[PDB]
Amino acid sequence: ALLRSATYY
Amino acid sequence: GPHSLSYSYTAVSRPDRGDSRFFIVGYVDDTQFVRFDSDAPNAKMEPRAQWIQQEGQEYWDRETQISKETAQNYRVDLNTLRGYYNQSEAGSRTIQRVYGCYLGPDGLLLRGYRQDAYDGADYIALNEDLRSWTAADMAAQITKRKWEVVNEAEGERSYLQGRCVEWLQKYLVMGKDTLQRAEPPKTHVTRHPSSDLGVTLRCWALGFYPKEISLSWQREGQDQSQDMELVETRPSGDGTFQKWAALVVPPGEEQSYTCHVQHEGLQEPLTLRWD
Amino acid sequence: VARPPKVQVYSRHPAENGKPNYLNCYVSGFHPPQIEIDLLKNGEKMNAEQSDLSFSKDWSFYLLVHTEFTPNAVDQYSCRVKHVTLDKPKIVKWDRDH
């Protein structure tokens, strides 16, 4: 299952 | 070897078409089991191994949702890294990302990892302590400082120590008869003439899993790795692999040369010879 | 950073005339990921499928293009690949011994 992390570079 | 669950992200910009494309592949060890492609007709996370197919729509809806959110973020991340490097807007560019967990004997995290790349070059990576980052340059330091500010590492560490290993264990059970049992190579030797002073002898190993194998030729006990052509291991197309090892011998010595196969599916190491 | 594809052409099982098999064109070690792959039979494109784009530790991409086929003594197979890294398309003929 995927890691759920919306993070911007 | 210890089992691993990993995901590979690939984001590619298309400034011409104004959009971008996002790929995901999920692996347990050497075995692909899911995929996502934002360019697909109503794109969703899809099964790619038989044993993951039993999952309920709940699983698929979630992974699909996470895939599209992530694809969305990458559309701006592509544009951000372009700004960090003062690059033009004309050409297609690429960000890549791998992350994963190795399963320990105690059923806990053995090792978690994450590395990112920009245009085929290392950008930033999570350290083994899962609490800090290493940036490869100026641009990555900007990214690193942001991820420090909002404590991105803790989200990663919590995932890797918890959810990642737990789902891996579940996948190891779901596909036990393929992921957990070794599959020995079907082996044989072929012979191929040429000149008067040479005959090529080629040792085959087919349909093996896992990927790690050892092919070697010996001449009366003596290694011949010096002049042994060895192909890069390649996929059969059905979840297993192929590899061959060859060398040229004088047209009568065929019996003085022996191929040596080691693979964990084999009970004992093998020694083959031409017939 | 650009990297030309390594191409390997082969069958899933040992080529045996008449007995249906799988013709594989394994394209690897390339970058960027945009690529075009055709399988050929006596020189003409077919209807193939392919596994999903992935990459190795060195960040280079790989995928398998493959179609179900039936080997004989007549038919000549191959693989045609184009990439930004190639002057003209690369054509690699299938060799059942290698």
Author numbering:
A (entry chain C): 1 to 9
B (entry chain A): 1 to 275
C (entry chain B): 1 to 98
Reproduce passages from the article:
Two parallel peptides, Hu64 and As64, from the O and Asia I serotypes, respectively, were both crystallized with SLA-2*HB01. The overall structure of SLA-2*HB01 retains the characteristics of MHC I molecules common in other mammals. Among these, the α1 and α2 domains form a typical peptide-binding groove, which contains two α-helices and eight β-sheets, and the Hu64 and As64 peptides are embedded in the groove.
The resolution of the SLA-2*HB01–As64–sβ2m crystal was 2.4 Å, also with two molecules in the asymmetric unit. However, the crystals of SLA-2*HB01–As64 showed no clear difference in peptide folding in the two conformations. However, SLA-2*HB01–As64–sβ2m can form more van der Waals interactions than SLA-2*HB01–Hu64–sβ2m-CM1. In addition, although the P5 (Ser) in SLA-2*HB01–As64 could not form a hydrogen bond with Glu 152, van der Waals interactions occurred, which indicates that having a hydrophilic amino acid in P5 in SLA-2*HB01 crystals should favor interaction with Glu 152. Regarding the potential of Hu64 and As64 as TCR epitopes, we speculate that As64 might be the more dominant epitope for binding to TCR, more strongly inducing CTL immunity because SLA-2*HB01–Hu64-CM1 and SLA-2*HB01–Hu64-CM2 exist in one crystal as two conformations of crystals.
